[PDB]
């Protein structure tokens, strides 16, 4: 049996969690689908992709510790081997 852990420390911080969710399209393409999430600040008009470690294979996504007091818009597009499709309608959230 192992020994006990030591120097256990617990700290507390206020953070933000944003959860996105959507339905897949009716026109799914010739094969399986993959999702790419894009982000844009309320001020700018600059849509930037949220790059990921893993392919977003489920129609849901989450973001941790977005800047507090800032407002964002999000939109999702689908990707095949054929190409990247047109974006969804955007939805706004304030952190």
3-state SS assignment for residue 74: strand
The pair phi, psi for residue 91, each rounded to 5°, is: -135, 145
Answer whether 78's CB lies under 8 Å from 35's CB.
yes
Instruction: Verify binding: residue 21, its own copies, rule CB under 8 A.
Output: yes
Among 43, 46, 54, 64, binds its own copies (CB under 8 A): 64
CB of 58 vs its own copies, minimal distance in Å: 12
Among 30, 51, 54, 58, binds its own copies (CB under 8 A): 30
Q: Are 49 and 36 in contact (CB under 8 A)?
A: yes
Kindly write out the interface string for residues 43-62 of this chain, putting x where it contacts its own copies by CB under 8 A and - elsewhere: ----------------x---
Question: Quick one: tokens of 42?
Answer: 């309320």
Q: Given the rule CB under 8 A, which residues bind its own copies?
A: 1-30, 33, 35, 59, 64, 68, 74-95
């Amino acid at each position: 049996v192992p020994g006990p852990p030591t120097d256990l420390s617990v700290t507390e911080a206020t953070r933000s969690y944003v959860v996105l969710s959507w339905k897949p399209p009716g026109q799914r393409g010739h094969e399986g689908i993959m999702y790419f999430v894009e982000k844009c600040e309320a001020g700018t008009e600059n849509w930037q992709r949220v790059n990921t470690e893993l392919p977003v294979k489920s129609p849901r996504f989450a973001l941790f510790d977005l800047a507090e007091g800032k407002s964002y818009c999000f939109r999702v597009r689908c990707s095949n081997s054929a190409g990247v499709g047109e974006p969804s309608e955007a939805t706004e959230v304030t952190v």
